[PDB]
Design a protein around this ligand. Structure first.
Ligand SMILES: CCc1ccccc1-c1ccc(CNCCc2nc3cccc(C)c3[nH]2)cc1Cl
Ligand SMILES: CCc1ccccc1-c1ccc(CNCCc2nc3cccc(C)c3[nH]2)cc1Cl
Lengths: 326, 325
């Protein structure tokens, strides 16, 4: 069978905590009355949910309301427990209330309001500094949640809300997040296709916080290279082929051999043979103003097949790419 | 109604600053992970907090962890905003971190560590110069926080930490501190009984930074006269009577008339009639080595009913009592 693996950081943080912290199945959720909130408008379609801007009628303050499609109660309890655990952490969306509408009884989560800037227009205005600044803000959220024994497992631009005017960033949608327990075998059907780490694609279940660092590397590459998404798979098997066209097939075999991973036969006719590309090959006139030796070195240290070799969020924060940020 | 009043110094310092500075209710607090700190032992206890000795495991440095009993979230936000605004100011306790334990989720504040010398231990070995030196250190903290538009509102010896060996002083516990806005009516249920200014006791809500100068006067009187506390009230109403036994009832009526203050009927049977006492009376063989004409003149200029008449922290720093520091 496969060789076991464990996180290089925060390995035993849940092991040394009482069961109340990580046993979400035994958590008692107190559902308040949603009558204190009036829905204003739809903001997005969540992930088995719908996100709204709303007004808290008791104080005239705007809030965000996430209405959950009750597909699995265990998953709702998980997201609530994680949100309660991380409540108030740096750059984490703040859970303010848990409510149900009296007639519908639909589970709803109430959050701190975020005034989302439309980035599809300011994507061209972004500077090298802005990318370094916001990448550091995401790293503060990840080092915090990882320290709290939680893996986000769905890091992607859609789950990062930015209020550019106030330079405020929040990591949202903790619906796929899980508690990290060393040696635990997790479901690989997590994250979004373009952001899935190689561990998920080769069905290596004993992954950790490092999965979020791969996803972060995908985001960085798409931003500095203005190539969205960076690895454009058309299905989960093709996704590994898109990564192999950049990282090469030699290092992929080294990875699968290191962990004694059995490669699915579906890869047989599609994987091929690919050279390891230089990161400099992706620089062009439209993106050269966001690229630097520091940025390419940092990206190279995140986008590694081997989940154990990737920088942790704390190591990433010490990289020279961030020497110019506060 | 009562006659309005405003501070003689730093009146408009908050008016000329954006709302982000003084609007603590809109401040976003980032609660870090307390796992970076290991609690060693309990140091001190407060009315709504507990102070523990701790170690920061990431750098092996001792810190102080103040664990807050979450009675009111608005008050926690206020103390944090004020500590962030004054962070690094002279003789102000330094907020190092804001954390919560993963399982308890109890708000905790992380401060610099102070090797506190006991208040009763140094008491007998204190010189006239030591009192002048440390009073000047408190004044640096007050003139600074007042300049930053903040009233401490709980000045007392328990909130002053001193490392005598290193001649280091810190003004602590900003849990009752508030932002000064000219014309604002504040809650009078602040400070500790013995240190409450007359304005609080007569329910005059439009007070300012001068409240801290009354409290400082109470501290200096207890030190130079070796009489702890100086105004020993047994309740908030009796506290005004104890001040009246020293300052006299004539000047108390002049004060309440000047500001058109309605005196609570609870004062009717207890206030009585009292002469204005001379400060020289409180001098005795056990305290004469810490008393001087300069000290009495300075004290007389702090312990005044009229909050507008008391010396400001800046004026106090220019007093002849400090010419030797
Ligand atoms: C300069 C930041 C950056 C650096 C590097 C790579 C990507 C990005 C980046 C680029 C754009 C965004 C903004 N994404 C918004 C996501 C989002 N809007 C919503 C509106 C309504 C509802 C939801 C769920 C929403 N969800 C976030 C990020 Cl983190
Ligand atoms: C009469 C006050 C006075 C007038 C003039 C000059 C100095 C002082 C003075 C001011 C402060 C102290 C020392 N107070 C210690 C306070 C204190 N320790 C703590 C230890 C643990 C926890 C807490 C909250 C603590 N809180 C002693 C003195 Cl002598």
């Amino acid at each position: 069978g496969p060789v076991p693996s464990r996180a290089r950081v925060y390995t035993d943080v849940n092991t040394h905590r009482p069961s109340e912290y990580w046993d979400y199945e035994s958590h008692v959720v107190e559902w308040g009355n949603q009558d204190d909130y009036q829905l204003v408008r739809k903001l997005g379609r969540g992930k088995y949910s719908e996100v709204f801007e709303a007004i808290n009628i008791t104080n005239n303050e705007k809030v965000v309301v996430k209405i959950l499609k009750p597909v699995k109660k265990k998953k709702i309890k998980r997201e609530i427990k994680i949100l309660e655990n991380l409540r108030g952490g740096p750059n984490i969306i703040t859970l303010a209330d848990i409510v149900k509408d009296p007639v519908s009884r639909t589970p709803a989560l109430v959050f701190e309001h975020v005034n989302n800037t439309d980035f599809k227009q300011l994507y061209q205005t972004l500077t090298d500094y802005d990318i370094r600044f916001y990448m550091y803000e995401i790293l503060k959220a990840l080092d915090y949640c990882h320290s709290m024994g939680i893996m986000h497992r769905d890091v992607k631009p859609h789950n990062v809300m930015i209020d550019h005017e106030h330079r405020k960033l929040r990591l949202i949608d903790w619906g796929l997040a899980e508690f990290y327990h060393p040696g635990q075998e997790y479901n690989v059907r997590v994250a979004s296709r373009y952001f899935k780490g190689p561990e998920l694609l080769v069905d290596y279940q004993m992954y950790d916080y490092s999965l979020d660092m791969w996803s972060l590397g995908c985001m960085l590459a798409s931003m500095i290279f203005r190539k969205e998404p960076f690895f454009h798979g058309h299905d989960n098997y093709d996704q590994l082929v898109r990564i192999a066209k950049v990282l090469g097939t030699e290092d992929l075999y080294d990875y699968i051999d290191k962990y004694n991973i059995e490669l699915d036969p579906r890869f047989n006719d599609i994987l091929g043979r690919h050279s390891r590309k230089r990161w400099e090959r992706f620089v062009h006139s439209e993106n050269q103003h966001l690229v630097s030796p520091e940025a390419l070195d940092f990206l190279d240290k995140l986008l590694r097949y081997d989940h154990q070799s990737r920088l942790t969020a704390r190591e990433a924060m010490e990289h020279p790419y961030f020497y110019t940020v506060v």
